[PDB]
Amino acid sequence: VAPTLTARLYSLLFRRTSTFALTIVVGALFFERAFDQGADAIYEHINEGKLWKHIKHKYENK
Amino acid sequence: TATYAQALQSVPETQVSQLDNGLRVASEQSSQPTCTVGVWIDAGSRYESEKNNGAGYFVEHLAFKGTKNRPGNALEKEVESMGAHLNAYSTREHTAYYIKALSKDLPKAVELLADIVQNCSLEDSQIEKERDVILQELQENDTSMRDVVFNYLHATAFQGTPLAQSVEGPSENVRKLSRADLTEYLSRHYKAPRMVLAAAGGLEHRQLLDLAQKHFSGLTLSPCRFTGSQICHREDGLPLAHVAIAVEGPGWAHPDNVALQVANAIIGHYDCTYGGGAHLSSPLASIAATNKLCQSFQTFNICYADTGLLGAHFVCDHMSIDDMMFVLQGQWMRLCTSATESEVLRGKNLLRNALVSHLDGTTPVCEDIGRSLLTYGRRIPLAEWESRIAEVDARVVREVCSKYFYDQCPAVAGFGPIEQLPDYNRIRSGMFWLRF
Amino acid sequence: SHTDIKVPDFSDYRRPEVLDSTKSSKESSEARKGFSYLVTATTTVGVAY
Amino acid sequence: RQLARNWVPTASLWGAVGAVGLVWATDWRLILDWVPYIN
Prior knowledge:
This is part of a larger assembly, with chains A, B, C and D.
Chain A (H helix, E strand, L loop, with lengths): L4 H10 L2 H30 L16
Helix pairs in contact in A: 1-2
Chain B lengths: L3 H4 L9 E2 L5 E2 L8 E8 L13 H9 L11 H8 L2 E6 L4 E8 L3 H13 L5 H17 L4 H14 L12 H6 L2 H11 L5 E7 L4 H6 L18 E4 L7 E9 L6 H12 L15 H8 L5 E8 L4 E9 L4 H18 L3 H16 L4 H14 L6 H9 L3 H11 L6 E5 L8 H8 L5
Parallel strand pairs in B: 7-11
Antiparallel strand pairs in B: 1-2, 3-5, 3-6, 4-5, 8-10, 8-11, 9-10
Helix pairs in contact in B: 10-13, 10-16, 12-16
Chain D lengths: L6 H18 L15
Function (chain A): Component of the ubiquinol-cytochrome c oxidoreductase, a multisubunit transmembrane complex that is part of the mitochondrial electron transport chain which drives oxidative phosphorylation.
Family (chain A): Belongs to the UQCR10/QCR9 family.
Keywords (chain A): Electron transport, Membrane, Mitochondrion, Mitochondrion inner membrane, Respiratory chain, Transmembrane, Transmembrane helix, Transport
């Protein structure tokens, strides 16, 4: 039997205070970069042809 | 001559001898006219059922009330006619029977001891006497807050297993016991391997083994639960509040069993009337005395078969109780990171100083053997202890406490006037530093 | 005198990995407890966002 | 004395963190896209 990630991760990170805090400080970076991107479509995928991002393709670069 | 290096070499060693029915023999020569004979029994309170609780205790009393062959108080007169001191004692795991005596009267001793080991006069003459005597005691035992607070702590974590229960058990079974269960519990647990026999004094082994002398010996445990919790009995009358704190630990046999010995050597301990003064090296011993944040404190270490206990026991006035608790913890925590070699030396020295001084007098060696056999068996790693001690390193330590302390779940044992005791969740978020 | 006190069980409060008195807490403790702190960290993430 | 223990690594571990913070804050530079970076 092998320790589930938690047993590992706790021994890995949460135990040592910084280490615990460290990945916490890490996670948000990629997160928001991933988060900001992934959500926008959900907004945008719903909003289609009503915005020059879609509209101005009619007249953009002439 | 004598050199602490040489002195480890010159020892009478422990002896090993077996019987057929499971009794073990053993011995060491003190070149002494006197000898301490004893008998050890591994029958634990945790073996007995809930109804069976307090029996052996009750039983232990019954032994010298006269035995099957030798009725009441003809027994004592002989040992008194000899002039020998006689004593016995109990513990949740272990019960003891032993005598200090000359090597001369040794032969009767065994055959006296042997008879009562199992053969027992069972008469209700005593059953009510002792019961009343015990009911006397049970109600009187409430006098010392010390022995009080312990049992709470066992039940605190070890609830769910017999390990936590009282030695003397509920007041009711004290009334409710028939000597059938006695004989029954006499029956089960007094056959070997459960039995262990030894003695120490001027006796060589063989002159023991001959008169180990044809009489007899004989024909379950579980992991106990370790529960983070609290117990609070608030009573405002008394002046002081005995408070101690603990976390579970390893079993008897283990390397870590060694490191923990020096662990408590670090903290030291302070009480009122020590000649210590402010100049003591131990941080709390000086400081907790400085403001007398404690009238007294000590530490404890006990390692069971599969279990062990770590912590300290302290006494202080109530209005300041918060102090000790605040200022106890770091003395664990600062170890866990910043600890130091030299500071251990003394403790390294102390434990060395400690175990050596343990060996004065006949009896103490005798007692050692029994637990040793019940614990590590034959082992008397005398010089090896030092080697076991020489093991120790600053890293070694800062590896150990890493296990059992940093961010763990303690249990809380306390007795009135608890009132100002910091609440639980502090202690928990107070165990692990945030780095301050 | 009393010596008898105890609460029968907290089971309905209590939880699976500790559900046996004959099991060592050291067994579950590592992974079990980490699950606790686990809530601490992730919940701080959105705070930063 | 000085025995400068895991604290030194601990210390080594502290400042590393918030160093990211600035970069993560709003007063850092533009690293190699390194997981999505819009133009």
